[PDB]
Amino acid sequence: GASQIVSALDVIYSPKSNNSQRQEAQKFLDEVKLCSESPFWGYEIALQNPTNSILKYFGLGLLDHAVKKNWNDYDEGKRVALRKWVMELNFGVQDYDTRYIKEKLATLWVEVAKRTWGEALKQTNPTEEQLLTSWVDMDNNLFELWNINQSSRELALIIFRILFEDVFLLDDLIVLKRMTVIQPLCVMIVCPIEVFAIKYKFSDKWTKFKANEEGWFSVWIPELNNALQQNNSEYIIRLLETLKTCLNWPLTEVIVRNDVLSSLLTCLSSNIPRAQSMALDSIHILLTRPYSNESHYQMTIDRVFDNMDLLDSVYESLLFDPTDDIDETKYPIIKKFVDMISCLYVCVPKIKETNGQIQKYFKLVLKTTYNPSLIVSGLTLDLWCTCLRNDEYLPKLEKYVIPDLLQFAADALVYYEQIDGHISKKFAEIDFQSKSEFQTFCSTYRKRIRDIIRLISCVELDLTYDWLNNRLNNYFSSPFGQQVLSSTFLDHKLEPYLGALSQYMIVECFINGCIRWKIWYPTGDDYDEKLDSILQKLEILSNQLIALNLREPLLLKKQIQNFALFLTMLKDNVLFTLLEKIITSATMDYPEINLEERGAESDAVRDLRYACGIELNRMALLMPESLKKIYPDLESVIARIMPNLSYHEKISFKSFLLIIVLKSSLDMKEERFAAIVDPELLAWSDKTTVVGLSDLHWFMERLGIVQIAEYFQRRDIDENSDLLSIPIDDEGKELKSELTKRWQSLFPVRATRMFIHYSMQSIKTDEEFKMLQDLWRPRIVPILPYITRLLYQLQSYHDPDNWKGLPTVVQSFVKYSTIERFWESKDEFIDEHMKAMQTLRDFADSVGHIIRYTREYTLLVLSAISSLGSVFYLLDESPDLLLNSIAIFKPGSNEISPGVSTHGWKHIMNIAIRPILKGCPKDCLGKFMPAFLPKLFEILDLLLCQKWSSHMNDMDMNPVPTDDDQMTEEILEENLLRQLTTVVVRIVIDCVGQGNANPNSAKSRLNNHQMEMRKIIFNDLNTLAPFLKLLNHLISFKDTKCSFNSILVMKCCLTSVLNQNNTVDEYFTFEVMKNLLLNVLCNSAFKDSFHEALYAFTVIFLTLCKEYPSARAFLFEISNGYNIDELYRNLRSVDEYKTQRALMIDFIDWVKSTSGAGDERKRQEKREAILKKANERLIKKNKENGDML
């Protein structure tokens, strides 16, 4: 019997065992694991050997394994015997028992209860026999265990914690099968009898499961208070551990009666760190729990606000000096406190002011926001953003809360990433595991500070303007800011430039906040008087800023970018001065430095010129009417600078001129439009380009790869020689400059995109749209085939097989050109300047950069052409030309455009396909969709199947946060593939429509596009079959968000495809349902999307099985002998889906079981992680409200 197990365990742990004995024993004990008498042996060994910790743990593990796998087929006698064994084992807990053995005993107790407790409730008058089988004495036995020993009391607390965690937080399959019985019992045990009867459906049979009528909250709370009086730290920790899980779900009446909030506040003041964190989490849970007794909600909020002074003292104790090192013992407590304080802003309006409770609370938030750590400071920024936006809170925080917050935000609007001495880096190195993650969080924090400053400027415009003028005047008069005013170039990573950039950022935020004042302020008679005065102040500020005469390129860039914001209010008052300043800024020369060189300081001038051009374009786009007055003068002035502003600014200025021609109301619109667009678009119709566009060798020659071979031969470069360690000759620089200059002129892709986009940007009325279509029709139509040919050639460039005929010397160069370097800027602080030119490897890198630039611009050109509308969606060439160029098919195999990385596909999906699909007009959907949707869906499905198949079983479910060891190409490729899958899921969502979560309604808000697209897709099987094939793969693919969204989309589309055609049901019978049940429902890694997938599978099974008897044989074959026919008749008896969920869960459990050392730590870690995730979901209730795309 158990003697063999004892001998094997002694052998496996004997020091004389070695490899010989542990094979002898470990195999033997694993055999005992599957034996029928395993639970009896495990119970026997644990009771007989209490001193041996590991041996008793092994017996308890055997008993747990027996109750988790062999429990299903056990009869009533075996079940009751196992329950009695667990009961006896738990009651024998003594002092010498360790902590984890008590946890195992608690888990054993809970597992038995979940499968037996309350089973007799479903039958009216269950008599005495069912009561014994249903464990009617669960509460009484727990009460008996409560007063046996202190260790017994701790075991009871752990049992309660584990039971309440599984039922209400983890929501496992066993609880989900019997939720409607388990949850009322859980409410019963804690709440008193008289409280339960009023709220619930309490009957005579229910009261038999309760031991004490007072409830359990009448025992824990006095115990917690008594422990607080005696300062027993260890007991308080366990009591709070139980309370933090038991305080969410139960009724509010018992919580109010027992004064749990008072006990939590009392234990908050204690010196125990862990107890403070537990109390804070419990209070935060209590604040955000649902309240069906809003009258009871008043005292809970009032109690916290009345103790606002005590909360401040707690934060003061938690604060620590980070100069030496952080204190990880209490640092998370600070974050929890900050989150709990930030949550409280919702209940502010429902507080009666008696002792400045609201005033005290807002001061506490302001003090919290001053925390040196970035995370806790940013946790309260969303509070100020929401609080300032609402007009109700303004009179409350108007007193000495606004100026301090504004000053703090202005002082904190700095670049934390680059400054070395900032204290935030110490917290960054512990809270953020990646430099890129810290940079992204810093950018988000700076954006939120921007929003705060804008809101402050809008709310308190007079005071904010006065303070800003006082600060700006003082800063430039300081002996530290005058360096900027008297310097040409400055270090873009040092303090003197950063401070001035921050000041200009603050000025930009203030100006942006003045625009919102136009809408926020009411339209009363004072609107005209106030607005006139503000415009004078803005004009004075603009004149003062201009008079500074800045010269630093990047700072002048920021000042020029600020000019567009000024024009919104000043309008014609300042337009002439701004136009004069911008024009001379781009033309301004820098004789001290030659602009031909690609130095870091030289790139600033180019960036400033680009910004000036784009700002001129935006200024023209804003309003052309006043620009028409000086149109001849502007034309002459700009033509005077034609030979000097290079090609880029030439295109920018031509586009600027084109805006005035179209948007304004001058004469000869056609002639002026043709005078500018035609010279730039002429290169598209070149005879040499047209003929050579179909030949890849001509494309290579024009790119200059063959010309590079001559340079390599002259330099005597070998193909096998490494290109990373070869210096660049001065001839190479000239060759690169010549090639990049000729390439842009050969394909005027940039000019076409800007021209079309700005011509079709602001289209007032409807007659203007018709005229503009007639203008672009003779031009775009003969050029679209050439654009598609160029895109196809560029896509075929990435193919390794294409360049086989190229010279062998430049083969390695071309291979190095194709790789997308290491790809994973909207804030003005980050500066990159795209490095410099050092080695021959960078020559391949820059050629690839040119290739990707051309591809991105041709995608933008295609999107802009799609923005035209009828002229592009009507011709029969467009549906076929676009798809042929996007994806190519080699004569052999089925690879879709071999040689292009995932990132390129992600961009060509998110740049061209999205606007083309979304931009189709209602009248044009009937002609473009039938010739475009099927091939596109087939291409997407095949590509997604191919890309994911390379490493199908080689990831984890959730993305892994990258770090210093995680720039491995596998991780980056995985992230890019996930992003591409998300992009195609968004494509499907925008195309057809996504459903809601388990809470159902009358479908989603399918406004206008989705109705038209659903009619085309669903009524055409030729388009429906590829779409259904694509959708199945999306669900089958291993990802969290994409699978959930695909399942929701399938549920939305489930009720309109299941009976239209016979062929559709054939695919559903064999492919969709089999994949859903076997690869999603059966798989244990899809727990996040289990509920929606289960519901979709149920809806599929119900309708399909009704009319297809042949499907039942398939289900019988898949499920391995399950009575499918019995399932159909059993389910049809109950109309409610909630009852059928238990039946489907039981059916799935059969399929999973039939098709089914470090394990202990792995399961424990997984349970801890999912418990933490559930706690976060509960805490952020009404803020998260689920996650979708």
Side-chain angles (χ1 to χ4, degrees):
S3 174
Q4 323 157 14
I5 292 99
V6 173
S7 55
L9 263 297
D10 172 41
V11 162
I12 204 166
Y13 294 150
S14 99
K16 344 314 181 283
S17 62
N18 332 296
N19 188 266
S20 295
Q21 300 328 301
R22 40 143 297 304
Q23 293 177 335
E24 173 266 302
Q26 209 280 335
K27 193 61 63 183
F28 172 72
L29 59 90
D30 194 26
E31 188 65 35
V32 185
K33 191 177 181 52
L34 271 303
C35 176
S36 81
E37 294 294 327
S38 301
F40 185 49
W41 287 322
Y43 157 75
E44 265 175 331
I45 183 55
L47 177 56
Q48 286 152 23
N49 289 48
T51 311
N52 200 311
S53 184
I54 175 65
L55 181 54
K56 192 166 158 185
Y57 183 81
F58 178 73
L60 289 175
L62 286 181
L63 197 51
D64 185 15
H65 164 78
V67 85
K68 285 217 282 179
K69 309 298 207 294
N70 216 7
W71 171 270
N72 204 284
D73 45 44
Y74 278 158
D75 57 350
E76 182 181 311
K78 211 62 171 183
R79 294 154 109 94
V80 69
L82 201 145
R83 175 162 73 84
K84 193 186 295 181
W85 288 337
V86 170
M87 231 181 238
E88 173 169 36
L89 264 178
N90 272 285
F91 268 62
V93 160
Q94 304 288 268
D95 300 326
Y96 43 74
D97 288 309
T98 78
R99 176 59 188 266
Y100 69 95
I101 186 169
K102 270 190 281 202
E103 195 87 22
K104 176 66 72 177
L105 281 153
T107 309
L108 257 185
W109 185 297
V110 167
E111 285 304 321
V112 167
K114 285 193 295 188
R115 302 160 211 280
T116 48
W117 200 29
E119 193 168 308
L121 267 305
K122 309 191 170 202
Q123 304 172 34
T124 167
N125 315 323
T127 73
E128 285 300 310
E129 179 167 47
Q130 275 91 314
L131 257 61
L132 188 54
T133 319
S134 187
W135 195 354
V136 79
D137 296 338
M138 160 91 154
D139 194 43
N140 207 355
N141 285 129
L142 270 174
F143 199 90
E144 287 141 24
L145 194 75
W146 176 267
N147 46 6
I148 292 301
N149 195 30
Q150 167 75 16
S151 196
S152 189
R153 204 163 284 174
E154 284 184 18
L155 169 64
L157 291 171
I158 299 159
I159 283 167
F160 273 123
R161 170 175 73 81
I162 293 187
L163 172 56
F164 294 147
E165 276 177 11
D166 282 7
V167 169
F168 292 102
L169 297 195
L170 296 196
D171 268 330
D172 50 350
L173 265 62
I174 307 306
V175 165
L176 192 53
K177 196 161 66 63
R178 306 160 34 79
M179 201 175 38
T180 66
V181 175
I182 279 290
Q183 291 197 355
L185 259 301
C186 278
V187 179
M188 201 77 138
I189 44 171
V190 287
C191 307
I193 280 184
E194 76 277 351
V195 181
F196 191 91
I198 306 303
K199 168 69 173 65
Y200 271 104
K201 55 180 185 295
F202 145 90
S203 315
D204 184 53
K205 55 189 178 179
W206 288 74
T207 198
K208 295 172 197 301
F209 286 73
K210 205 167 177 55
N212 54 86
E213 65 271 32
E214 286 76 13
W216 276 93
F217 261 43
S218 79
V219 181
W220 297 334
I221 295 307
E223 269 302 280
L224 206 155
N225 217 357
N226 214 345
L228 278 181
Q229 186 173 355
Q230 304 159 43
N231 205 36
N232 194 350
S233 64
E234 169 87 336
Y235 198 35
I236 293 159
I237 296 165
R238 323 297 270 282
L239 287 169
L240 288 174
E241 269 178 338
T242 298
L243 260 288
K244 74 176 289 184
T245 69
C246 197
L247 214 61
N248 166 79
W249 45 275
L251 284 164
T252 317
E253 167 76 14
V254 47
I255 285 172
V256 160
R257 278 187 188 195
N258 289 111
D259 295 288
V260 181
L261 203 39
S262 174
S263 179
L264 285 174
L265 286 182
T266 303
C267 84
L268 179 45
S269 83
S270 302
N271 296 319
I272 304 102
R274 193 150 176 229
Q276 279 185 9
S277 168
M278 216 85 67
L280 285 206
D281 195 41
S282 179
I283 281 180
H284 194 10
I285 274 173
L286 192 61
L287 282 180
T288 78
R289 85 179 289 269
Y291 268 83
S292 166
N293 224 339
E294 148 77 19
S295 51
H296 290 60
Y297 182 80
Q298 190 57 40
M299 310 78 79
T300 286
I301 303 310
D302 276 356
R303 172 67 56 75
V304 163
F305 268 73
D306 285 329
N307 282 271
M308 199 35 80
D309 172 46
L310 182 134
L311 267 297
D312 163 71
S313 189
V314 157
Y315 177 74
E316 201 68 29
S317 163
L318 286 178
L319 199 60
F320 62 97
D321 179 25
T323 312
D324 312 323
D325 196 359
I326 72 160
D327 207 324
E328 316 94 334
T329 72
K330 46 181 153 191
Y331 179 74
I333 314 181
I334 276 184
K335 305 211 278 184
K336 283 168 162 63
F337 175 87
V338 171
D339 207 5
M340 180 268 251
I341 287 299
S342 297
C343 163
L344 266 179
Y345 88 101
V346 179
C347 318
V348 169
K350 294 192 294 193
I351 303 311
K352 175 62 185 291
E353 293 88 352
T354 307
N355 302 116
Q357 285 86 353
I358 297 182
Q359 209 59 68
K360 277 185 189 308
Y361 161 70
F362 275 129
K363 197 172 295 183
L364 194 144
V365 183
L366 185 76
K367 183 197 295 292
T368 283
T369 320
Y370 276 134
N371 203 305
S373 172
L374 271 195
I375 286 91
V376 285
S377 191
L379 275 174
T380 74
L381 254 58
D382 201 9
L383 182 144
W384 295 115
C385 179
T386 300
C387 195
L388 281 165
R389 197 141 41 218
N390 193 304
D391 197 86
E392 164 60 39
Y393 308 84
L394 291 186
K396 303 184 177 304
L397 44 66
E398 192 266 332
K399 290 182 177 181
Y400 64 100
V401 179
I402 291 296
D404 294 343
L405 178 58
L406 160 73
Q407 180 66 51
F408 148 78
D411 276 337
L413 190 42
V414 86
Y415 191 36
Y416 308 105
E417 195 273 335
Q418 212 276 343
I419 175 63
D420 308 316
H422 210 274
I423 324 174
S424 295
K425 279 183 172 177
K426 290 179 182 176
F427 297 93
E429 91 167 345
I430 186 64
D431 288 330
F432 298 137
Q433 217 174 356
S434 175
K435 196 169 180 69
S436 178
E437 211 173 7
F438 171 59
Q439 180 77 269
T440 297
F441 177 81
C442 181
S443 168
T444 301
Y445 183 86
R446 265 181 266 98
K447 177 194 293 181
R448 261 134 78 207
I449 288 288
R450 190 178 308 140
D451 210 357
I452 295 305
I453 295 278
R454 170 177 65 111
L455 292 185
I456 291 282
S457 299
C458 173
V459 164
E460 284 271 26
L461 155 54
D462 278 312
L463 163 70
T464 298
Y465 164 80
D466 172 47
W467 158 90
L468 167 68
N469 173 265
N470 178 266
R471 159 199 187 95
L472 194 70
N473 167 50
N474 170 270
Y475 167 82
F476 281 112
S477 306
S478 86
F480 194 53
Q482 92 286 32
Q483 272 195 341
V484 170
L485 198 136
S486 295
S487 56
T488 49
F489 317 138
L490 272 186
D491 187 281
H492 301 141
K493 285 201 169 188
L494 289 178
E495 193 65 29
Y497 146 77
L498 217 71
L501 179 61
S502 181
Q503 304 290 352
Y504 271 94
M505 265 209 74
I506 281 295
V507 165
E508 179 194 67
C509 307
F510 165 77
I511 295 157
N512 214 335
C514 201
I515 281 170
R516 181 191 140 93
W517 182 89
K518 272 192 170 182
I519 288 152
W520 170 87
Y521 200 83
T523 64
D525 65 336
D526 204 44
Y527 189 92
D528 298 357
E529 179 62 36
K530 268 183 166 63
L531 182 75
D532 174 47
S533 172
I534 297 316
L535 257 56
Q536 177 185 358
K537 312 218 187 96
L538 268 177
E539 183 169 41
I540 285 161
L541 173 59
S542 167
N543 278 350
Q544 154 170 0
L545 269 164
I546 272 171
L548 293 186
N549 207 332
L550 261 63
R551 204 170 310 81
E552 204 289 327
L554 288 197
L555 277 183
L556 202 31
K557 174 157 112 94
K558 188 50 188 222
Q559 171 163 330
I560 291 305
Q561 267 180 249
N562 271 323
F563 280 174
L565 265 296
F566 267 120
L567 205 55
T568 318
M569 331 285 278
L570 272 308
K571 205 74 65 162
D572 201 89
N573 288 320
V574 86
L575 182 135
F576 287 169
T577 308
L578 295 196
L579 181 129
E580 164 59 40
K581 200 61 175 175
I582 292 166
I583 283 284
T584 189
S585 84
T587 320
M588 175 140 71
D589 193 9
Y590 287 97
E592 305 86 356
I593 180 171
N594 53 293
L595 308 186
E596 43 268 53
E597 186 181 0
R598 259 285 296 107
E601 53 184 1
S602 165
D603 192 25
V605 181
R606 283 172 60 251
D607 290 326
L608 163 67
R609 291 172 175 205
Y610 300 147
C612 284
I614 195 163
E615 276 316 308
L616 273 174
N617 263 280
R618 182 182 297 165
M619 190 155 87
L621 184 73
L622 203 72
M623 30 141 337
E625 181 67 23
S626 181
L627 276 310
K628 197 201 85 195
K629 322 289 179 168
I630 46 189
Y631 182 81
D633 183 48
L634 282 171
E635 199 164 82
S636 175
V637 161
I638 277 167
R640 198 251 316 283
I641 330 168
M642 211 45 48
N644 290 337
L645 84 176
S646 84
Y647 175 78
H648 219 82
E649 315 300 326
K650 149 198 299 179
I651 282 311
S652 189
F653 275 38
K654 286 197 179 197
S655 173
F656 159 82
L657 256 72
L658 193 65
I659 286 293
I660 300 169
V661 172
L662 292 179
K663 302 315 170 82
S664 90
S665 59
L666 82 173
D667 217 10
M668 332 325 301
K669 295 229 177 133
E670 156 77 12
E671 170 60 39
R672 287 182 214 272
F673 175 83
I676 306 159
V677 171
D678 286 346
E680 297 314 307
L681 264 284
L682 177 58
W684 270 117
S685 80
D686 193 4
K687 288 149 296 315
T688 315
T689 305
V690 162
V691 171
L693 214 42
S694 68
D695 169 38
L696 192 136
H697 189 66
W698 175 93
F699 186 86
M700 291 295 168
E701 173 165 311
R702 278 300 153 274
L703 185 51
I705 280 162
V706 59
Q707 196 167 3
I708 284 177
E710 316 313 302
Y711 167 68
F712 273 43
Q713 286 289 333
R714 275 185 270 97
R715 278 276 300 279
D716 193 20
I717 316 297
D718 301 338
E719 60 274 14
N720 52 3
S721 65
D722 161 77
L723 273 307
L724 192 44
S725 177
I726 303 185
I728 280 193
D729 187 278
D730 192 31
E731 171 177 3
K733 301 257 198 171
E734 170 172 58
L735 184 71
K736 166 60 157 48
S737 177
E738 175 186 326
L739 259 302
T740 189
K741 205 264 195 180
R742 186 252 309 280
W743 176 265
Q744 276 168 0
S745 176
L746 180 56
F747 296 101
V749 58
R750 172 184 142 88
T752 293
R753 159 63 158 72
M754 191 165 328
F755 280 175
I756 298 274
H757 170 75
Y758 277 153
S759 296
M760 301 325 278
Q761 190 36 64
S762 68
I763 181 62
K764 52 177 54 50
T765 79
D766 181 64
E767 184 58 39
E768 287 280 296
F769 200 100
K770 211 69 71 188
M771 161 275 268
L772 276 183
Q773 292 224 64
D774 309 330
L775 294 200
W776 280 119
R777 165 169 287 113
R779 284 96 162 96
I780 297 309
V781 167
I783 299 313
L784 186 54
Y786 306 141
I787 295 163
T788 36
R789 282 285 92 190
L790 163 73
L791 179 52
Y792 156 78
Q793 214 69 253
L794 206 152
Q795 206 68 250
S796 178
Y797 162 84
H798 284 51
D799 178 36
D801 183 55
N802 274 119
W803 65 63
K804 187 166 302 309
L806 262 58
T808 52
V809 186
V810 294
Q811 285 188 343
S812 58
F813 181 88
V814 169
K815 171 63 168 295
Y816 281 128
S817 81
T818 58
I819 176 173
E820 288 224 65
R821 192 64 281 166
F822 260 59
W823 285 131
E824 223 300 308
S825 304
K826 41 196 91 194
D827 214 78
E828 255 298 322
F829 280 107
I830 314 91
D831 176 35
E832 294 175 350
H833 68 270
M834 174 203 340
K835 78 201 62 51
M837 201 45 168
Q838 272 90 231
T839 82
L840 267 299
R841 174 91 191 300
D842 318 288
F843 203 10
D845 215 37
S846 182
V847 161
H849 168 75
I850 284 178
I851 280 301
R852 314 186 187 85
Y853 160 99
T854 300
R855 177 155 58 84
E856 195 89 355
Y857 255 119
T858 197
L859 298 160
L860 287 177
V861 153
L862 277 182
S863 163
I865 294 319
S866 80
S867 181
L868 275 181
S870 304
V871 78
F872 168 69
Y873 282 109
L874 258 293
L875 74 154
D876 303 324
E877 283 72 30
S878 49
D880 271 318
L881 258 55
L882 166 65
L883 281 175
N884 275 1
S885 59
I886 278 296
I888 82 167
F889 285 155
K890 301 301 290 187
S893 86
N894 240 12
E895 293 177 350
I896 288 154
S897 70
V900 49
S901 172
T902 299
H903 188 51
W905 270 105
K906 194 200 83 157
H907 286 175
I908 81 174
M909 215 50 75
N910 203 14
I911 294 296
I913 295 304
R914 271 275 284 278
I916 283 166
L917 279 181
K918 274 164 59 180
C920 185
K922 208 156 192 170
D923 294 330
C924 313
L925 282 156
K927 192 155 164 61
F928 199 64
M929 291 315 78
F932 183 67
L933 281 182
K935 291 171 183 177
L936 161 72
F937 279 137
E938 170 183 311
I939 277 170
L940 274 168
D941 182 18
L942 203 47
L943 166 150
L944 231 57
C945 170
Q946 167 181 281
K947 284 296 184 191
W948 274 89
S949 180
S950 76
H951 46 278
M952 192 46 257
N953 46 357
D954 209 35
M955 52 294 301
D956 213 330
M957 208 31 38
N958 227 16
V960 182
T962 179
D963 56 298
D964 56 349
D965 58 47
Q966 271 187 65
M967 39 295 290
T968 326
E969 87 280 14
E970 171 260 308
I971 281 309
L972 195 49
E973 215 275 335
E974 177 70 19
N975 210 327
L976 287 177
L977 189 55
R978 288 167 127 103
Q979 281 157 58
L980 170 66
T981 315
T982 296
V983 160
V984 311
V985 162
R986 272 178 183 149
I987 283 290
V988 161
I989 283 173
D990 284 342
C991 280
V992 191
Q994 188 183 7
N996 288 337
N998 215 313
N1000 286 128
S1001 178
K1003 290 180 178 179
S1004 83
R1005 293 182 183 174
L1006 309 94
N1007 41 9
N1008 268 310
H1009 194 66
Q1010 293 177 335
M1011 321 315 268
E1012 276 296 328
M1013 291 266 298
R1014 281 162 75 97
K1015 289 178 181 176
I1016 293 299
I1017 290 172
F1018 294 151
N1019 296 294
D1020 206 318
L1021 83 162
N1022 193 271
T1023 85
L1024 174 54
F1027 173 71
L1028 278 171
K1029 210 155 73 180
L1030 189 148
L1031 202 63
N1032 190 9
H1033 286 113
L1034 275 184
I1035 298 173
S1036 72
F1037 282 149
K1038 278 183 162 185
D1039 191 21
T1040 307
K1041 289 217 296 184
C1042 304
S1043 174
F1044 193 75
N1045 288 269
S1046 54
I1047 286 155
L1048 288 194
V1049 166
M1050 167 145 252
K1051 180 212 291 189
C1052 198
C1053 309
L1054 192 42
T1055 180
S1056 194
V1057 293
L1058 277 191
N1059 273 324
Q1060 274 72 9
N1061 195 280
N1062 170 56
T1063 311
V1064 176
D1065 276 330
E1066 210 82 18
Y1067 188 83
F1068 270 100
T1069 302
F1070 296 97
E1071 306 316 304
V1072 152
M1073 154 182 25
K1074 157 191 170 184
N1075 170 55
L1076 207 68
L1077 156 73
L1078 199 58
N1079 295 326
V1080 174
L1081 262 55
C1082 201
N1083 192 243
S1084 169
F1086 289 90
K1087 301 216 175 196
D1088 201 290
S1089 78
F1090 181 81
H1091 289 242
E1092 313 291 336
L1094 165 64
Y1095 172 75
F1097 174 77
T1098 295
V1099 183
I1100 279 158
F1101 179 44
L1102 259 300
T1103 41
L1104 203 141
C1105 185
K1106 181 175 167 182
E1107 311 190 62
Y1108 290 81
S1110 71
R1112 294 178 176 181
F1114 194 52
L1115 271 309
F1116 186 85
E1117 166 60 39
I1118 286 181
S1119 188
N1120 295 338
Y1122 202 102
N1123 290 345
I1124 302 298
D1125 168 78
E1126 181 172 6
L1127 254 181
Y1128 186 75
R1129 62 183 69 254
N1130 202 1
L1131 199 147
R1132 195 64 76 188
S1133 83
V1134 188
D1135 303 347
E1136 171 48 68
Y1137 160 74
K1138 199 184 185 186
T1139 310
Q1140 318 154 0
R1141 199 176 59 242
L1143 278 86
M1144 221 65 58
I1145 282 282
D1146 182 72
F1147 165 68
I1148 287 154
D1149 194 29
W1150 166 271
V1151 170
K1152 195 186 298 188
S1153 172
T1154 308
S1155 312
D1159 285 299
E1160 163 267 310
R1161 184 56 40 75
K1162 198 127 70 191
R1163 307 168 281 185
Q1164 189 66 58
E1165 182 177 1
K1166 180 140 212 182
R1167 201 168 170 290
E1168 187 273 336
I1170 187 150
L1171 206 86
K1172 162 206 290 313
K1173 178 190 313 305
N1175 269 22
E1176 301 301 332
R1177 183 175 316 288
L1178 202 182
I1179 273 288
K1180 293 179 179 179
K1181 183 190 183 69
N1182 289 337
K1183 298 186 284 193
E1184 282 300 323
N1185 192 31
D1187 62 322
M1188 317 159 97
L1189 279 176

